[PDB]
Amino acid sequence: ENFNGGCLAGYMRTADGRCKPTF
């Protein structure tokens, strides 16, 4: 499962790129 920026799956890309939680 490719990444949508460099996350695991579900996390969001903050303003710093920090894959944060989207839940």
Curated annotation (Swiss-Prot):
Disulfide bonds join C7-C19. Belongs to the GBP/PSP1/paralytic peptide family. Mediates the spreading of plasmatocytes to foreign surfaces. Plasmocytes are a class of hemocytes involved in insect cellular immunity. This is Plasmatocyte-spreading peptide. The lineage of its organism: Eukaryota, Metazoa, Ecdysozoa, Arthropoda, Hexapoda. The gene is PSP1.
